[PDB]
Nucleic acid binder design. Structure first.
Ligand code: PLR
Ligand code: PLR
Ligand code: PLR
Ligand code: PLR
Lengths: 445, 445, 458, 458
RNA sequence: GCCCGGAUGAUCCUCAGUGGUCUGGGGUGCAGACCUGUUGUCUCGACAGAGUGGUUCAAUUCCACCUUUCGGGCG
């Protein structure tokens, strides 16, 4: 009786989640999290005790390892002709989906975009979620053939436009200092050259590898509002960046943003394979949702549910704070290391996540040193250290890129990337710095 | 030393899997399965001990519940511009993907289509996987606008064509007996009316609700070979059906089949959200693969890996045998129950999975009895008992269906569905029969 | 059942929340009658029930602060999760059976477990059992706890009368308790070794009832030995007023062993009978059950345990019996008999082909023996090298018993050890049908014995 | 380290397979030196290691057939998986420390665990410890096993000399073993109750050394009592040739308790010291450690255990120490001291505001007491109703000790029970800084005591 | 004057934090002696960013001025 009244303490955390839909401020104990998950899972028809199933999709599970690791959630999210709809044969999974979308909406606000109207989790990654946006827009703009796209050398967001069946119009960037930024003149020149009606959307990018910086979203959103063109923003890993989220918030204030897309793994530290589509026009975000054919995985949504309830909005905020500190620390360590090898930290103040160290002192043409550096870093187990040499030609779905991975035809120098992304620890920078040192010292030869 | 030599017995089951790529004949013990999974997971860079990560996608995991339930597989499958490629930052997950595709290829052979050339698992469900097929074909057939589609009242495969941005041409079916079958005359009439060049593909269906039966794939594949039109087959839940798989095997022998698509949950008893795309032209199946933008979830692939290694090809074969027996048993029980209520089992010999019992004795117009029946069955926890009344109009993405859910404008009677799908148990039929009885007896009023 | 609940829902989250009621009916039924379920619970009901219990324990409370030395803090999540967050053990430090106010959930787990185990003991053959409790010690230490309890009732006692069985744990259990085992040799009656009742009485008379702590008999054992004559020994004990403690280590699985305990208690005196958890319920090693017919004496043994004890063995058997259900357990019991028939018939066969025979031991319902008279050990050491041969080919629990093996256990020296007598006529091989044996087990055994015997032929 | 392995890979599945080598180095190091890792293992290394061990056990063999009665068959997958498929317990039935040939993996788990625990005992203060073993009984039964072992060495002994501490388990442990506790009252020296050494000797002399089984002293205890004077008692024991058994239930966490055991052993005689696993290592209740300085006597206690024992407590502490590492344990120890300072300073404060005081008990490094002289219990029963008040508001392990509580434990009647003397001057309240206490624990406690005291003011 | 029930969470239950999306803890129930001004991110019932005039992206009530005032100058 002291405990059956102490169970009330759990039930109250749970009631609070379902009533107001926001993140817990402080993370739930696992005991509460798992109790909740079990409460939901037994709401799905496949877990009923007196159930019989005479259909073709009944959520039957052949292996107990599979049923357990998914907390007995088998029916996925949505129904046949709506990914947004309650599934009567899975009441528990449907509530799971509603709660996750509502938590993620809360975190998108807390992270910067306070005026987001609606969003939903979609169990495909960011590139494919961008594609779903483009496929939704086709029906709205049946005459459109082109997507105007300020260049960023990332194969997934590029292919997303081609997979959707449109032609990307690659707008090269302008080099301002060390930074590569949006060529606003060319974007509007192209809008006028091709004609608004022939434009499906402008496709911009906020999170990206230095020396590129987040696109000028405010200006681009003004162009988009003026010419009545849809604006789609690739916010692949920018939820973690108050600067990135600011732009989106501001771009929607000054102008037009139809949807912005985010990755779950890059922003929430869960496995790869999910994304969020969010926007400001409520009915439109619903339209993208209703364009998804069939049911989908509940796995990315369960990971996000589990992570945000465990972290709480305080735990998430702490991760974001720690990311800013590690950026400075990484930045200062790159500064110090570079100076010793007569290189420098490229000046890229407008990129809040990514950094670049020059590699001018390595000769790729004669000693292949730049490429060797990337190998040595990889065999010495440094992960995510993107090395970028000059003059790489690369073909991606037909389109040829000169100076590929550098985001422009002729960047001044070869360089090396490093980033401070959510969840990085001091050990990461120190090991990176130490091992980059050993590598440089060795390429001197 | 007796055990360090008994560990060799595990390592040998594992070597055999990686060398020959086929299902174990008899299922692995869990001890072997989990040892293998752990061996692979520590091959991914995120699980290295001396690893440091300075990138934006590092497979960092915030919650231990999430990392454990995925056996520490965080990086998903594929790379940015290839879903088929080895991920150097995730060697273990990549091997996971190769092995799963190779096991699934083995099971597709064992199940009937012995001449399948290539296939791959894609972590989106069947509707969306069909869409990916259509999006791949667009580039091959830039003039095409129409998909010719023998009707089947299922919202997901229908929407798949619209989501891909094509217009479905709905070819009504011919009523032969109680069965609804392909109207081969109309399909060819439409090919000629519209013109082969304007046809993206013919989109046929094998697994479906009675009284529809599997499409005449051999004939359709001959039409497709003749007019040089792509043939895409929706095999949503037909892997479990030797008859269904026969057609595909025969259709490819006599004619043309470019790809056939299957659901993971309906055929392998794992959670919803994955599918297989398979075909006979090796390079084309690779082309569909390379059309996927970005990395994707490894979750559906891990479920399938876990299930097939636990079941073995013998365990899978047993499920298939048991499904045939339960079909007869269900069929005979429906026969007996119906007779008592002056109804009958619709004669649909060509449908190997689904059955239909007539509901002529229930008046939907005046007593709403048909609809009430579906409610009562649902509140009495009968799952998957599709009730189908006459004259339902329904709009799906703009297109209006008369007689929706009946697959034709005017079927003779209202009826009730039931199916024998993989994993069904005698208890399912007996509880279904018992509860359908109570329901009928009660609607008599 | 689900009908009246359906008629109600017929007058969509309502279907689900009212489907939690199904699980609750199963739980409400368990802890209001305390019997095993007829059919096993689904895992979802099982884990639901456990999760509810664990949050009843104070260490899992949400608004909790602990200022004590035993608060149930867990350093490793791997450790906390694998125990379903049950950390406080069973009992209070003054009473292993007392409700722990700091752990209401673990107390409830313990009571329920004892209740289920009582139910099984009844269903298994001893219908008149009065009381029992799970104790997280093996059978050997649980026998010791029985002897430790009897000392206080019989303070002049030094001796425990023990019909020989060559098993080091039950033998040492007497010495650990502080008493001196009086080993009564067995009588060869046919092929089987049985209780020498005259020698027991002769020894009761020589040493004196007041000097005897108890008679310590054994039901489950390895052929050719058979269960002790509990009815006769129960009458000796009743006449001379000597307590009777029965080692029933793996005889819950045998209705012949259990009906023999029930019968002994009907015509005479049995004070407690002790059973292993792992041998009878297929859980890990380390727990036992102490059961009896005098409710208060079983409570006295319980109250003699000093301190708190692990809840791990209680939780293993609670999960197993709820998953199996009484029907599931009965089936396991029915199959054990069937596999016992099959195993002997197969051993009759195999033995014939090697000029050996199945020793006639009908009174033993679990263990069989086959002669190895063919093999010479004095010359070419063929018998002692069949033991390791069977092991190498992974035949577990196949016991090879040579002639004239000498062995010292705690200072006492056995002759013909492993054979329960000093000169059994021949060398032999053991094999048994214990609960959970599958046909594959026997077929594999026969097959490898065949290859092993053929080999020895060199 | 990873450098020379990188230079090698520099002369893509090769990066991975050679990254299994990292885990192997950690494992190769563990079982070749047997020390704790300095830094905790990652879970992936931990679960890799365990999975490897478990398949070394015969029950997990792939080509296995079992024809025995103890084959380690598991009925429930929930049960098998939560124990990492470790089913065969520890030991052979004749020796709890013997390698089980049918369970090579569990044997290796047991040896390693004992080795790690030995390492911790050294790092914790008793650097001269010779040997120890984990035993799956709590501290109470483990004390009993110590007494059961001494009986065989001292067969005329009846008595155990015990400086009083009001805790029912260690007290009953003597009675369960079959001996009669001789309770030596404590001497009030200041605020704290300490060993009455004159009364101990007076009792050794009255009863006679040969009649004493051992002296049973206690280090960890609840204030105002403090650790026994082990050095003085170790000298008494050495002079009169009486074995000395120390109840160190939760004193591994205290370097003052441990350096006091090490010191007692330097100047005199300590035969064994027994520690709880859950109080010192934050694992579930139910295991203990028996340690000593004579290697052979510790082996004799081990060899007195009859049968096989649960491996569950060994596995809990193996997981915890490998996850914590020696650095992780040291940190927990350093933080316990810090929280002990903080807890008293906070209790000094709070007490002042209520006209109460922190009893001066510097010799006790774990437990504190605050007076409750304000509250009248003879009138308005205010003290006995603060106990339940603190409980209701979920203050666990806050002990309220009234005056004149009488209590009967196993027939012996204590006066002033819970206070360790028959008339302590005042009623008081206990609180302690035990390992794993977090600042939130203290702040919450002070806060609710404040509300509780304020309330009582009615 | 002038379980200048600074309950000024009806912007200096004052009368802590940032009806015209919060005039959590605890001067309870069921600048020129008065004056003037002052019902975080980016470089039956119905109608009327401030926890969540139900500047800036009908509810305090269910910057300028005016969980009024101060349980200073003149179990
Ligand atoms: C299973 C099913 C599908 C699959 O739809 P999804 O929900 O996307 O998996 C498509 N068509 C038919 C006929 C089906 O039965
Ligand atoms: C993360 C990333 C994407 C996402 O690609 P997916 O692999 O499909 O998730 C897209 N664009 C950029 C710049 C990215 O960094
Ligand atoms: C913990 C403790 C014991 C042992 O109690 P158990 O339940 O046997 O573990 C004995 N004495 C004291 C002082 C203790 O703190
Ligand atoms: C199992 C058994 C025991 C008990 O051995 P433990 O290791 O103590 O569990 C004792 N006697 C016999 C005959 C047994 O079979």
């Amino acid at each position: 009786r002291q405990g059956c009244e102490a169970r009330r303490s759990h039930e109250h955390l749970i009631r609070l989640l379902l009533e107001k839909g926001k993140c817990p401020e402080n993370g739930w104990d696992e005991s509460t999290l798992e109790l909740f998950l079990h409460e939901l899972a037994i709401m799905d028809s496949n877990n009923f005790l007196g159930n019989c199933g005479v259909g073709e999709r009944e959520g039957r599970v052949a292996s107990a390892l599979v049923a357990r690791r998914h907390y007995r959630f088998i029916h996925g999210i949505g129904r046949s002709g709506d990914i947004s709809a309650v599934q009567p044969k899975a009441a528990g999974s449907s509530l799971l989906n509603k709660i996750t979308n509502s938590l993620v909406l809360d975190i998108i606000k807390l992270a910067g975009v306070h005026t987001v109207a609606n969003c939903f989790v979609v169990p495909m990654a960011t590139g494919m979620s961008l594609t779903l946006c483009f496929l939704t827009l086709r029906h709205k703009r049946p005459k459109a053939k082109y997507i105007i796209w300020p260049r960023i050398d990332q194969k997934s967001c590029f292919k997303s436009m081609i997979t959707a069946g449109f032609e990307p119009v690659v707008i090269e960037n302008v080099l301002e200092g060390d930074e590569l930024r949006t060529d606003l003149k060319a974007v509007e020149a192209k809008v006028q050259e091709l004609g608004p009606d022939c434009i499906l959307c402008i496709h911009s990018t906020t999170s990206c590898f230095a020396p590129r910086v987040p696109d000028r979203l405010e200006e681009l959103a003004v162009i988009c509002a003026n010419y009545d063109i849809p604006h789609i923003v690739n916010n692949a890993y920018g939820v973690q960046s108050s600067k990135c989220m600011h732009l989106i918030q501001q771009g929607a204030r000054v102008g037009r943003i139809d949807a912005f897309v985010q990755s779950l793994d890059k922003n929430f530290m869960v496995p790869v394979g999910g994304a969020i589509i969010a926007g400001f026009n409520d009915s439109f975000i619903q339209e993208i949702s209703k364009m998804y054919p069939g049911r989908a995985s509940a796995s990315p949504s369960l990971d996000v549910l589990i992570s945000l309830l465990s972290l709480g909005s305080n735990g998430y905020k702490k991760l974001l704070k720690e990311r800013k500190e590690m950026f400075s620390y990484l930045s200062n360590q790159i500064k110090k290391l570079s100076e010793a090898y007569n290189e420098r930290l490229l000046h890229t103040p407008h990129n809040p996540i990514s950094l670049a160290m020059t590699l001018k002192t390595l000769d790729e043409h004669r000693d292949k040193a730049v490429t060797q550096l990337g190998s040595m870093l990889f065999t010495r187990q440094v992960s995510g250290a993107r090395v970028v040499p000059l003059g790489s030609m690369q073909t991606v779905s037909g389109y040829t890129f000169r100076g590929f991975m550098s985001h422009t035809n002729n960047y001044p120098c070869a360089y090396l990337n490093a980033a401070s992304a959510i969840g990085m620890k001091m050990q990461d920078v120190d090991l990176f710095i130490k091992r980059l040192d050993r590598c440089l010292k060795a390429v001197r030869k």
